């Protein structure tokens, strides 16, 4: 749902496509050290 609206606004139709919700790191260490990059 909302794929056409996302396309009109300029985003990917699937929210799991390109964007901060997918490409940002999932987790990181509590001490602040960045996590290794995701394989996907």
């Amino acid at each position: 749902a909302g794929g056409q609206w996302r396309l009109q606004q300029g985003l990917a139709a699937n929210p799991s496509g390109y964007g901060p919700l997918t490409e940002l790191p999932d987790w990181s260490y509590a001490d602040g050290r960045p996590a290794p990059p995701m394989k996907g």
């Binding site: 996302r6 300029g10 985003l11 990917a12 496509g17 390109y18 901060p20």
Partner: protein, 75 residues
């Protein structure tokens, strides 16, 4: 038509592919034009240079941006 699709490389659906706007490629596309969606490749920021060949993103609008920060615009 199956063989032309295989030659074009569109074996997987919903996967963008780049081709050259030349008469031969256009003739190949004219046979499978009822199975494909064709868009022009828009380059608002130019060709990806050697340095920024890993921060490129193809948006749904057909634009290949060379900077991808994953951050909101401050404006």
């Amino acid at each position: 038509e199956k063989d032309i699709i295989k030659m074009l490389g569109l074996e997987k659906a919903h996967t963008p592919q780049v081709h050259k706007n030349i008469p031969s490629v256009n003739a190949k596309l004219k046979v499978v034009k009822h199975l494909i969606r064709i868009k022009p490749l828009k380059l608002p920021q130019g060709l990806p240079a050697e340095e920024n060949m890993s921060n490129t993103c193809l948006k749904s609008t057909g634009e290949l941006v060379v900077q991808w920060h994953l951050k909101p615009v401050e404006q």
